[PDB]
Amino acid sequence: TNVVPAKDAPTTNSPPSTTSPNQAAADANQQQAGIVSSQSGPNAVGDSAPSSSVNNDGDIITRPTSDSIAAVANATKPAAVVSDPQSMKVTPIVNPSSYVCNVCNARFSTMSALSEHLRSDHRDDASTLLATPMINNAIRSFLTAWDDIR
């Protein structure tokens, strides 16, 4: 039965709110929408119709009370991070190999480069990975801060 589909459109909106007038006006609007309340017997004078003019608290919704509340909260913001006196907050060196900040003495560059150098000292992707060139070059490597040499 078609009766159901038709039915459903009412159900969907149980708060018929068209415009934003006072309670009495909303009542007239829904009346004219619904039927024709033209010189009716009964004295309808007290009757009211749900409207966007009010909330659940009897307050006048200028703009949806939620949106008001959220914009109102923004009121309560001072100046983020304004620091005025001079501080003394130092740091360990930022540039040479800043994942450990140098390892194995030898000179480093980029942060990548550390990982990439580290590899030759094993651990970092190179702790005897099944195979090798066997007879690897250089043999001897004389290392120190003043000379890194093979």
Side-chain angles (χ1 to χ4, degrees):
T1 196
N2 58 307
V3 185
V4 160
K7 280 190 85 179
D8 306 320
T11 324
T12 37
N13 192 268
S14 172
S17 289
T18 43
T19 47
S20 197
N22 177 288
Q23 274 49 59
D27 200 287
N29 194 257
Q30 269 76 284
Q31 271 195 355
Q32 267 57 79
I35 43 70
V36 279
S37 51
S38 56
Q39 283 303 94
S40 56
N43 318 127
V45 303
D47 312 312
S48 302
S51 181
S52 313
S53 48
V54 282
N55 85 343
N56 72 321
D57 314 315
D59 53 77
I60 294 117
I61 309 176
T62 41
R63 67 167 178 119
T65 49
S66 46
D67 67 41
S68 318
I69 81 179
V72 170
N74 216 94
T76 74
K77 292 83 182 86
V81 198
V82 184
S83 186
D84 285 75
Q86 182 71 61
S87 178
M88 306 288 162
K89 280 168 171 177
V90 290
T91 196
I93 199 75
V94 195
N95 189 271
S97 67
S98 324
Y99 289 158
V100 200
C101 300
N102 283 34
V103 194
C104 63
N105 183 160
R107 314 105 191 207
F108 296 96
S109 173
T110 66
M111 294 84 188
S112 70
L114 174 68
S115 174
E116 279 76 271
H117 203 329
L118 268 184
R119 289 179 188 206
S120 79
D121 295 82
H122 296 6
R123 287 152 285 235
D124 199 322
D125 283 82
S127 295
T128 56
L129 299 186
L130 276 70
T132 172
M134 310 305 167
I135 304 291
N136 56 84
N137 232 295
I139 297 105
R140 308 184 205 304
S141 173
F142 197 117
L143 298 173
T144 184
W146 62 95
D147 61 69
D148 302 308
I149 55 180
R150 83 302 72 235

